[PDB]
Amino acid sequence: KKIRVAINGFGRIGRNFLRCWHGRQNTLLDVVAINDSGGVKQASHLLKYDSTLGTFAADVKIVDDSHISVDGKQIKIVSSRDPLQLPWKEMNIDLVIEGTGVFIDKVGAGKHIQAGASKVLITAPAKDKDIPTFVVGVNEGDYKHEYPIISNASCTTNCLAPFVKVLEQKFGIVKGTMTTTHSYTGDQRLLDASHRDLRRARAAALNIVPTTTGAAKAVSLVLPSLKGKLNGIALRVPTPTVSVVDLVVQVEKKTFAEEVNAAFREAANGPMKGVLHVEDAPLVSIDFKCTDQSTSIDASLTMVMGDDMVKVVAWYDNEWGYSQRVVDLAEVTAKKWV
Amino acid sequence: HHHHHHMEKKIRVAINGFGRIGRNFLRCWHGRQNTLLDVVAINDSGGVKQASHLLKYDSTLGTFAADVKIVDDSHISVDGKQIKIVSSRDPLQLPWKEMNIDLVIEGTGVFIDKVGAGKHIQAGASKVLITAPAKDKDIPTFVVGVNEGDYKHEYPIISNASCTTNCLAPFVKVLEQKFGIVKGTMTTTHSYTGDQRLLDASHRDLRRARAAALNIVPTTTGAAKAVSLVLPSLKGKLNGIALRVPTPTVSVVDLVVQVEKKTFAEEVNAAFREAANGPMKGVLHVEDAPLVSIDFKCTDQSTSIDASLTMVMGDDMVKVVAWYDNEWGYSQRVVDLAEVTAKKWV
Amino acid sequence: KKIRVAINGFGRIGRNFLRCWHGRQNTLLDVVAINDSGGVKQASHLLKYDSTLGTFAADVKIVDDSHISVDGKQIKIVSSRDPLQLPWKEMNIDLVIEGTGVFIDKVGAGKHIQAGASKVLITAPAKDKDIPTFVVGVNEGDYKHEYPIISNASCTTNCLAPFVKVLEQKFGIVKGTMTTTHSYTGDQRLLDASHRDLRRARAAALNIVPTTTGAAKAVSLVLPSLKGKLNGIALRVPTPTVSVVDLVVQVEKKTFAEEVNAAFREAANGPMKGVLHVEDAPLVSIDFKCTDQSTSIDASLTMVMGDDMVKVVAWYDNEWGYSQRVVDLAEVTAKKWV
Amino acid sequence: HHHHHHMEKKIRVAINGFGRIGRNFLRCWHGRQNTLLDVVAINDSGGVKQASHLLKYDSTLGTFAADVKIVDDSHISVDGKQIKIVSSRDPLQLPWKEMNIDLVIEGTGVFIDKVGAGKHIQAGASKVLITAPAKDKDIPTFVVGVNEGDYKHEYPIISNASCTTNCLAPFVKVLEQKFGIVKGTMTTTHSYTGDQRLLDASHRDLRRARAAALNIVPTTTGAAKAVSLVLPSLKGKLNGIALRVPTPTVSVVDLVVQVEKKTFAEEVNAAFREAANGPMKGVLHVEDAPLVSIDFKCTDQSTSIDASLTMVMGDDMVKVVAWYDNEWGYSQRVVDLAEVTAKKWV
Ligand SMILES: NC(=O)C1=CN([C@@H]2O[C@H](COP(=O)(O)OP(=O)(O)OC[C@H]3O[C@@H](n4cnc5c(N)ncnc54)[C@H](OP(=O)(O)O)[C@@H]3O)[C@@H](O)[C@H]2O)C=CC1
Ligand SMILES: NC(=O)C1=CN([C@@H]2O[C@H](COP(=O)(O)OP(=O)(O)OC[C@H]3O[C@@H](n4cnc5c(N)ncnc54)[C@H](OP(=O)(O)O)[C@@H]3O)[C@@H](O)[C@H]2O)C=CC1
Ligand SMILES: NC(=O)C1=CN([C@@H]2O[C@H](COP(=O)(O)OP(=O)(O)OC[C@H]3O[C@@H](n4cnc5c(N)ncnc54)[C@H](OP(=O)(O)O)[C@@H]3O)[C@@H](O)[C@H]2O)C=CC1
Ligand SMILES: NC(=O)C1=CN([C@@H]2O[C@H](COP(=O)(O)OP(=O)(O)OC[C@H]3O[C@@H](n4cnc5c(N)ncnc54)[C@H](OP(=O)(O)O)[C@@H]3O)[C@@H](O)[C@H]2O)C=CC1
């Protein structure tokens, strides 16, 4: 009943994924392989020690030049930058977690399947429009085992789509805009240096850095009713994890702050429990670190102007919360496996 | 003889509260090629040692190129010009009558109502300019480039509003003039300030209590409602919040307004460039380069529109992103408002 | 057998102390009161949420206008800035934890005893030379219940004294100097602003800030053989917790790095277990956050030049590690109580 | 005629690697009132768009006051002076012979041995100056103010050492001259650099792999041993470590040496002031004000002794604390060493 999982790209998301999976009380996933350069010494070290996750409580050991163990469970470590040379056939790999960011299209991602894997889950927006995209709590019931390659979307779309779905259900969105005030990521430079994006080129811990986001338009992938309704931008700021979405939408049904928050609470207590949370305490970004939910509505910041302009402020741990959804989506593929 | 040359006379200025705004104000004023302002006194608890040191060395502004010296025990000099340093927590005890002080720059954040700011006038000064929103609703508020032409010498106590309101009101004025505003909301992603705690510690605001360089910290702002004090057609139309982030200066306003006239991003930016090239030159700027927050440090304008970020959704929802150096840019406006009072003096 | 404890000054150390005490498996301490301004709402909120400690797992509730509860145990909250008005007599206060920093002399600290307390433990260097000073792992066996006012010294002395004691035992110190590269503290300003010390006046998160330290000379209080042998300075850097001591000493007995590290390991495995730790992994400051030990020797950084110049690099969580020693010292007073 | 005026001729310079040091070097050179250097080429993968943008806008240095323009598709201009932008990862393909390049500034951190740096000479250049320690032990190393008088035109490949060695060696030279060094150790509390990771990520050095703006990060340094390359009497006498901390520039060396002659803090500082006022003017500075790291940004000297921190324990253990802007100060020395090669050319 368990499925055999391989992680491709042991970066922030790959390592978050493992630690999220290892913390699961009950799981249908058996992680047997990690493809990554740097090898057993980097993989074991960076899995154990983490500047934002903290020290992993599990026993992490280097078994030999191609294996690590986590609390005694051995994991093969491989190290090939080109996917076509991966031993997924020999290792009977069921599902590949694609966390490199590099192979996000059918040609790139499909290479895992050629080398033996049956299914690929991309931890990022797909470049191709023919790769289905899912957000747990929104449209994961639409997933079918017949899909060989799937996308769990971006961390920002996973924050936005759950509370946008509630807004569309209760009040109806006409159009809107969003800004995510977002922790810096590994894509940005530490000091001013080469980058395709001249804003991301600038020292990340010193600056507020505007950058494009696809998340506002990507919401229409999991909520078709949102097509063309939203746009937005990102502001990268000098924090290492936890981000916040600032959404302003014009709604169909005139309303007020407590009625909007009531809708979120109803979803949080029912169909979106564990995915959407409504926070009533006056907190700051660090308080939402390592929260399992995709979205935490900051209830006291909800604002309605002129009856139909609604402003919602939503916290999300863009690393840990997203990785829990990657685990949730992988567990869906396992429970649907034929 | 035939005639004398025209002589605009200089008003005598005292700075009360030699903090970030107080010291920014001094450096902004000292850099002006022309001024009608003669800064003759500073009220700092720390005496000449603190005042000279913190004026010279600045972690945000960098080192002051001017020659700063301790002349004696109650005076410093800036490029040879001496300034008296007084040290009184109570404005009633300040020697303004003795020093013939015309205008007081209130930068303590404490004497922000008629009673408190009025103590300077009881002490001998003629006029008080509060570098903050006034707590008193009958205290007139001005934003240069927006409504400073409504200033009158007969106002003894005036407010230069908040730094966020000074960024917001200029480009909101253009939006209201050209397209008309129905309603709107904003968020300012704002550098941390001295009101925030370095490590989690006591604060009336439980979010401002949290470590400022570690967190995104939501806090209230009156700046969106305050716009209506300088643009009365906007009463009840704007609200917003602030998000304090771990940078030491420069902030950015993100405004979303529903407008009456359907428009598009290039038409909105064209309206800003029109204002920037004409009536709002030096106050409002339109930036075309792909810059980040640090690039707007020590910029003299109140507002820098990030033109590439302008968005319009569904014809009448306009999103505008505007940078502002909340310390230097605001302080240049404090100098400008003080110059208005000098030009219209008596 | 338990003693009744009051905490004066619910700041970083006061709140760290409570959370350290609440985590103790077995304790002789019963914390019944906290004297502090801001009252139940600040005290409950800042006890629950913490930017470096993280969220307190215990249930923290506001019972009424003068009480909070931690997992159901009620704690009276009082709020008087002058110690003389404290109800320690009425509350039968045995021991006061002095964490304000303001009352560090017999006149200041003794005011607690006048108002009813029997003993005062200062969480800082004493201003007076007649107030005995103790460092757990070094000279806590010299404490006597007859001492009404005691000092647990500074966080830097608690890092330095344990491994300095080993160095003096094994090799003999002639003279030395230390620099602590230290996280910023609440004494520093966030932005350039008024301060008695014009260096501490400067923006703390932007700067390397030199400042004086008494810790090098304070070591002679708990190790008399060190009198006049050490001096040093502090460099405050833009991290919120965890610091590192860089000690260079000339020693009597010529030696080498592995022999110096062997001495530390012997103490760490024996008489200084739980106080001194020798770290063999290549770690960074965040990895030592919330470590219970006073001192973590970074073994691979130990260096010996010219046979008798020894350089030792020691990590310490200046908040959590120090607070565990404050708890350890308080537990000593309880076990010695007559 | 009687005579011609004396004409020191300018050598033609190419910058390879337009990073922090490459761009600092350009801005340092452009600010010189006199120079024998004519920078005619830059090798940047990013083409004119990147080069012009990152030269103009700098999060550490601030905005470049000079006029920076894209002239065409292979040239930028700086105050009207054009500079060719080439884009070749392989130095063997660079057009140095075609461009008559005399000297190449190697600031890639890659071509640091005779083979790699020698590729520029195969490509047509005459001499290579590595802005880093040379991996090759026969590559001569120079520190201005210490041993640049031993430089010879007949060296085709030279090293300007590391930024820490440039801070250390000047004030170590004074200590050795006046008191004599037995042995010593140091720690540099150092700003983070581009070799460190923003978030925990892959790195050969498991400590440099850790998030740079969040941590105190110990790392190895050859700078203490490297002093012996420019001061041979110091061979085997110094070692040390580095502690990377969350600041973006400016670093501080903390040196503890046992000396032969018993001394005291004022006598040590007097020795530094002697050097600072005479043979090491412009290289070594003695700071008396109580400053912090940011105050030493964009200081041209290699070393600033924090005089109040000088300590002597037990007569012969001297502790010295010295500030250095590891980007700007070092780059001014790169310009200085390049000027030495120009002055002694052929
Ligand atoms: N960080 C976040 O907040 C989130 C990011 N994501 C997505 O997750 C993905 C990774 O982001 P993140 O993990 O943050 O960035 P990281 O750089 O931290 O992870 C990247 C990892 O991929 C590895 N890698 C790169 N190329 C290859 C290759 N050819 N073969 C094998 N391994 C390779 C890198 O190893 P090396 O260092 O050796 O190149 C690195 O360990 C991206 O698609 C990103 O958009 C989505 C949601 C959350
Ligand atoms: N910083 C910003 O971005 C902007 C702030 N403002 C406003 O400007 C004002 C100051 O802000 P800022 O300068 O940033 O904060 P600061 O704390 O840096 O300035 C405060 C100064 O006031 C002094 N002070 C306080 N009380 C008294 C008193 N009773 N008598 C004399 N001096 C006193 C303080 O001295 P001590 O330290 O000795 O108490 C300190 O130097 C506030 O009203 C703020 O809202 C507006 C726009 C921009
Ligand atoms: N932080 C560290 O790393 C360590 C610090 N220490 C020592 O611990 C002590 C506290 O340091 P820290 O806790 O960091 O600084 P904090 O400011 O965080 O703690 C100070 C607390 O004392 C309270 N306080 C101040 N005056 C009074 C008063 N008159 N009556 C009652 N409560 C008062 C403050 O409340 P309000 O905010 O209302 O004034 C604040 O909560 C100092 O002596 C320090 O030297 C020693 C080792 C570790
Ligand atoms: N930063 C400091 O404090 C100091 C550093 N140094 C030394 O200076 C050198 C550079 O340091 P720094 O400038 O800080 O690091 P940077 O990475 O900022 O400079 C590196 C530059 O080299 C370019 N580059 C890399 N490989 C090549 C190549 N094969 N061909 C052409 N260009 C290339 C990079 O471009 P891309 O980004 O496109 O790869 C980048 O622009 C290093 O040797 C360093 O040790 C010495 C003293 C001071």
Residue numbers in the entry:
A (entry chain O), C (entry chain O): 1A, 1B, 1C, 2 to 18, 18A, 18B, 19 to 34, 36 to 60, ...
B (entry chain R), D (entry chain R): -6 to 1, 1A, 1B, 1C, 2 to 18, 18A, 18B, 19 to 34, ...
Kindly provide excerpts from the paper associated with this entry.
Unlike land plants, Chlamydomonas along with other green microalgae and cyanobacteria only contains homotetrameric photosynthetic GAPDH isoform composed by A-type subunits (i.e., GAPA). As observed in other GAPDH from plant and non-plant sources, the crystal structure of CrGAPA revealed that the catalytic Cys149 is located in close proximity to a histidine residue (i.e., His176) crucial for thiol deprotonation and thiolate stabilization.
An additional structure of the enzyme complexed with NADP+ and showing the catalytic Cys149 oxidized to sulphinate/sulphonate (-SO2−/−SO3–) is also reported. The superimposition of the two independent chains determines a root mean square deviation (rmsd) of 0.21 Å (326 aligned Cα atoms) and 0.30 Å (335 aligned Cα atoms) in the case of NADP- and NAD-CrGapA, respectively. In reduced and oxidized NADP-CrGAPA structure, the well-defined electron density allowed the building of the whole non-cleavable His-tag (MHHHHHHM) at the N-terminal end of chain R. This portion disordered in chain O, breaks the 222 symmetry of the tetrameric structure which became a dimer of dimers (C2 symmetry) and is stabilized by interactions with symmetry related molecules. The reactivity (i.e., nucleophilicity) of the catalytic Cys149 thiol group is ensured by the interaction with the basic imidazole ring of His176 (Cys149 SG – His176 NE2 = 3.3–3.4 Å) and by hydrogen bond formation with the backbone amino group and side chain hydroxyl group of Thr150 (Cys149 SG – Thr150 N = 3.2–3.3 Å and Cys149 SG – Thr150 OG1 = 3.9–4.2 Å).
